[PDB]
Write a protein that binds this ligand. Sequence first.
Ligand SMILES: [Zn+2]
Ligand SMILES: [Zn+2]
Lengths: 75, 13
Amino acid sequence: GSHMAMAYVIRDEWGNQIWICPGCNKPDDGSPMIGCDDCDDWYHWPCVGIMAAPPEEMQWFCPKCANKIKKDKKH
Amino acid sequence: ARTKQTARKSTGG
Ligand SMILES: [Zn+2]
Ligand SMILES: [Zn+2]
């Protein structure tokens, strides 16, 4: 079946999901990654502009999702 | 903002 994972995710030899950062196209090295609150994609910190971990209580959206959101001037 | 490190060894966390 072609249904594997057409996304930035692969499995290792044991069968764990290894997320690939769509930012650099590099896999996870056991690195701190941030998941978007919309697409749930997994990017590395230096790839999106994160340097310290924000809480799950605070939302964050990647350059993918935050762009469609736009974060318009009107608030 | 789900932040986690897939680590079996991390310094601090
Ligand atoms: Zn990356
Ligand atoms: Zn996103």
